[PDB]
Amino acid sequence: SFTIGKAIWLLWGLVFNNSVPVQNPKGTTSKIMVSVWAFFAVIF
Amino acid sequence: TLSSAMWFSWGVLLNSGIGEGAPRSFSARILGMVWAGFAMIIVASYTA
Structure with missing residues (x-):
């Protein structure tokens, strides 16, 4: 269930003071x- | 559960979210608590 778009979301959130669940x-x-x-x- | 107890330190020092495993025994939890403490008191100081 790991696509190629659901990973930029995680890494962007992580670079930006991770606060949103991924x-x-x-x-x-x-x-x-x-x-x-x-x-x-x-x-x- | 050695792998989880190895992942815990890296996942609490690097502000990551990889790995979901928490200490269960009470006698080992308190120590881990101050571990989190140490995290801040290094990284913040660095920035300063």
């Missing part, structure tokens, strides 16, 4: 990648 991924690699993106967002 649907997290399930793969381990995707988990590590969204974690790296979170580090990016906090630094930015």
